[PDB]
Symmetry: C2
Subunit: 396 residues, 2 copies
């Protein structure tokens, strides 16, 4: 029935870093770990986090249902975080926002709501893509269509190619644009480059969707939130599926947003009254906690000032691990240009470790990087650099 | 596109109690409010709640991603809450559990996972049904099929009728059984009565699903969790989609479970490895908070002992409002037998207020009960009884 003749074959969190406990090793680190990690390789409760949580405990008098759209401040600031300021999408009210359990959990929200109401059948992808994006897309119809993103060799973005096999298929066809920077590649489009495909998405029907997981990680937070803004006062209709789990260190309590910015007020009202609709049908109403905690910081003149900064270093640290990794090669290695990393936004970079390198790695080297030469510059440590940079130059 | 030729017509939280602020009234209460409310008609942060939350704040060192299945204790106790003890479904390991954002959010989980893997096309319903169950069901295929539940007149359960037009359609057809007691009706099957349809679901293919939102509200918690247990060491395959939001007063932080109890270990493993699968595709991984907080109480010998009891009175209070409502009529009213309530589990009862009674109610009476003669015995107060019981006997 249900019973047998069931497949199994699960999501590869596990392509790496699980049984890292493994065969009782002296192993350095786990690299290609998604989440962020310090010089002790710890995943902490910020401070901001906790200083806001103190608030709640004593201030919260009701764990009563939170609205279907979650909370409205969470939005108003989500909103001015995204693209806004005093800025008119906010004042046009061309923008209407949703409290979603994750950005992951605001990307399917995007699916099943756009399946119906909207004339969507396909989702144009990116390659390499964050592969939980092929999956959550056929979660309610649709199909993903993986265009040309990274062109290998000189480890960068192909615009020659992307602007070719993306360009392709039909007017009511959507894409989901990728923030500042990428997964698995750390690669991005420049505002020159992006601004340039904004007018080309204005001119081909298209109609965007964006995955905004990392603001102020390796570009800035605001200029890194402008590679969206390129589009924002350009389009008419679009959507942002955003997170707080990377920049707030709030992975577990589930928070993101589903901002549909339709062309009016009254439109943005109903294209969304149906966006309103979706929520109910699974998890009617969002969780409060991490959500509460994102609005609260922003609110306290002296709490976000401490968050923004607690964010700054989560970066300084990433940006650090790049320049370091590479010194450790020019300084150590002297082989190939290990170069290209530093100048790629995020914690992710697509190492050029063609596959069974990444394998004659997990042994008598007890080292982990997820198959695609995909590493976490986040779990790349000062104390962890040296050991690593030996086992790279050994594997070549 | 998305833009216009969008419908709107939203979920009627709103069939009542929103604009209750309304036309500047002296109005009593809002009755038919779902959530629970005290003698001050407040929706509180229990104590248990907060005493567990103190724990977390200081004890929690990571807001790092929670597993896709959420936490395992949450399950192990969910598990022994459900049906277990030292009891073998637990030790057969015929049962395998999921941390879900709600029971609402563990009922679609049930849908899209059973759509595929499993040979399901229809969901047999109940009438009156909790109407967020027609909706979240066509959320990924399927169709609901509303059998005979309540037969009106002498305001009870029809077994004559239910055992007739439920019985009907085909072997790979499922139902979702309704806990102890009901929504909107407060009506239940007895263990004699239920035990009697257990062997008749064993004999017709069928294969259950249960909605377990209210344990220990107007039957007991355990005997009220046995009207499941009737089935549990009966079936082979089934599922429970449970909540903590009513019994934990944790509406907002989102918690429930998705317990698939397949016939073995290795089966329960894969019919579920696909149950494992679903989670990812929307909200990969559950929120921690309220989830954390449910396991923690159970754990502390002296914290659940305080929760179980904080639960006891949330009931004493409901059970109170029944006997009272009715005194207030025999004592006040003297008309019809207002009787039937007290002896119906939960906070809900299906008042016999045929529709435009419930309407020549919301005026110069400023009173609210959601259309179907559907009231909250939870928002029925001592100070609120008298006023109410005047406007009933006035409307007849």
């Amino acid at each position: 029935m249900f019973e047998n003749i069931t497949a199994a074959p699960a999501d590869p969190i596990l392509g790496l870093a699980d049984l890292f406990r493994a065969d009782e090793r002296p192993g350095k680190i786990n690299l290609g770990i998604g989440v962020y990690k310090d010089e002790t390789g710890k995943t902490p409760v910020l401070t901001s986090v906790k200083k806001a949580e103190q608030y709640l405990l004593e201030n919260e008098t009701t764990k009563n249902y939170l609205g279907i759209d979650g909370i409205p401040e969470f939005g108003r600031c989500t909103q001015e975080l995204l693209f806004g300021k005093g800025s008119a999408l906010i004042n046009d009210k061309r923008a209407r926002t949703a409290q979603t359990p994750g950005g992951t959990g605001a990307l399917r929200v995007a699916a099943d709501f756009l399946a119906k109401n909207t004339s969507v059948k396909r989702v144009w992808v990116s390659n390499p893509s964050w592969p939980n994006h092929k999956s959550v897309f056929n979660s309610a119809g649709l199909e993903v269509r993986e265009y040309a993103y990274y062109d290998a060799e000189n480890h960068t973005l192909d615009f020659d190619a992307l602007i070719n096999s993306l360009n392709e298929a039909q007017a009511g066809d959507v894409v989901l644009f990728h923030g500042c920077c990428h997964n698995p590649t750390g690669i991005d489009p420049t505002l020159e480059q992006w601004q340039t495909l904004a007018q080309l998405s204005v001119e081909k029907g298209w109609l965007p969707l964006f995955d905004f997981a990392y603001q102020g990680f390796a570009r800035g937070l605001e200029e890194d939130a402008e590679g969206l803004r390129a589009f924002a006062a350009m389009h008419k209709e679009l959507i942002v599926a955003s997170s707080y789990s990377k920049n707030f260190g709030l992975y577990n309590e589930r928070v993101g947003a589903c901002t549909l910015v339709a062309a009016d007020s009254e439109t943005v009202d109903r294209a969304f009254s149906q966006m309103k609709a979706a929520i109910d049908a699974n998890y009617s109403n969002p969780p409060a906690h991490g959500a509460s905690v994102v609005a609260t910081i922003l609110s306290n003149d002296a709490l976000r000032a401490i968050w923004e900064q607690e964010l700054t270093d989560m970066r300084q640290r990433i940006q650090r691990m790049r320049q370091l990794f590479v010194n450790t090669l020019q300084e150590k290695g002297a082989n190939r240009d290990f170069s290209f990393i530093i100048k790629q936004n995020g914690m992710f970079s697509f190492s050029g470790l063609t596959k069974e390198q990444v394998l004659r790695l997990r042994e008598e080297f007890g080292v982990y990087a997820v198959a695609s030469g995909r590493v976490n510059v986040a779990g790349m440590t000062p104390d962890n650099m040296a050991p690593l940079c030996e086992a790279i130059v050994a594997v070549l």
